[PDB]
């Protein structure tokens, strides 16, 4: 069993620098022997990870609701496409299926995946590494907006701290690494 | 059965304000005869919607993961106390009770719980409308960051005009009347 990393990501924007983002995660994700878990798409980010991750001989595994197939182009090129009944169950099978996790800059459903895996592993739920990997400011102001959460009681400290956050993909992966 | 509210709200801080804001909108959704789903416990502003609707005779369901229990004070005195495996088995039973759904001010715990239910009627999962209910600003710079997601294509205009932002009790229990 390779060690398993999960990258949440965007699934429609087709911006170079995401694309470009994505496609370095998915290749040194597969370089380190790694398993890549996705969302299972062939769109914007979500594509080119997977993609990147085939092209290095890496191991991809994709999860996608039945609901999204045609809508999300469900990824026929994943090693192993796993298809949900729902996206509960889309999120429960990445989560099990995943050592870590890194999300990528993306929309609402993106973050919808990121503050699940945030408040579980704040909960003590799951003790898996979160990364959010974001190299060109994409959530400068989420952040910042969070953080004066703190304060205000909202958001403790020791949430705010068990989030990892990077801006280049050599230091997300470290801090994916098996200990 | 009864028209069902949803209201997903903070766990953790005390603030007046925000106590009896959650206390207001117990009281009127009980007072509009109408049945609160929520979190099910006792802290915060959880504990304050249920009290106060419950203290007007309202039907009140409270959906907890057993894992939650001792810590979020289970609110044993709901009408219906419905204790779960898991969080995202929560978050189905929350949903699949209500046709409509608040957001007031919380943490990272209401922002999983509101980007989910965003989501899920984005992607036509659901037609139930989703209400974030904000009379001190408390999202200003969430929704300041998300407009900005918008003319680079990561949120669509579409995705945005579904949220129905308001400052007060009254409006966003008229928005979840029935039709």
Same mark, same amino acid.
């Not at 085939?54 to 090129?77: M, N």
């Given at each position: 069993?390779?060690?398993?990393? =999960?990258?949440? =990501?965007?699934?429609?924007?087709?911006?170079?620098?995401?694309?470009?983002?994505?496609?370095?995660?998915?290749?040194?994700?597969?370089?380190?022997?790694?398993?890549?878990?996705?969302?299972?798409?062939?769109?914007?980010?979500?594509?080119?990870?997977?993609?990147?991750?085939?092209?290095?001989?890496?191991?991809?595994?994709?999860?996608?609701?039945?609901?999204?197939?045609?809508?999300?182009?469900?990824?026929?090129?994943?090693?192993?496409?796993?298809?949900?009944?729902?996206?509960?169950?889309?999120?429960?099978?990445?989560?099990?299926?995943?050592?870590?996790?890194?999300?990528?800059?993306?929309?609402?459903?993106?973050?919808?995946?990121?503050?699940?895996?945030?408040?579980?592993?704040?909960?003590?739920?799951?003790?898996?590494?979160?990364?959010?990997?974001?190299?060109?400011?994409?959530?400068?102001?989420?952040?910042?907006?969070?953080?004066?959460?703190?304060?205000?009681?909202?958001?403790?400290?020791?949430?705010?701290?068990?989030?990892?956050?990077?801006?280049?993909?050599?230091?997300?992966?470290?801090? =994916?690494?098996?200990?």
């Amino acid at each position: 069993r390779q060690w398993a990393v =999960c990258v949440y =990501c965007a699934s429609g924007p087709t911006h170079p620098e995401l694309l470009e983002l994505a496609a370095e995660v998915g290749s040194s994700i597969a370089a380190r022997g790694w398993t890549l878990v996705s969302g299972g798409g062939n769109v914007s980010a979500m594509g080119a990870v997977a993609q990147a991750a085939r092209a290095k001989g890496g191991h991809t595994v994709g999860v996608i609701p039945k609901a999204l197939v045609h809508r999300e182009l469900a990824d026929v090129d994943a090693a192993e496409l796993i298809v949900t009944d729902t996206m509960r169950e889309r999120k429960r099978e990445m989560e099990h299926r995943s050592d870590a996790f890194i999300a990528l800059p993306g929309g609402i459903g993106t973050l919808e995946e990121f503050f699940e895996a945030w408040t579980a592993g704040y909960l003590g739920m799951h003790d898996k590494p979160l990364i959010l990997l974001d190299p060109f400011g994409h959530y400068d102001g989420l952040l910042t907006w969070l953080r004066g959460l703190v304060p205000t009681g909202y958001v403790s400290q020791r949430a705010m701290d068990s989030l990892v956050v990077v801006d280049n993909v050599e230091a997300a992966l470290e801090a =994916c690494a098996p200990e």
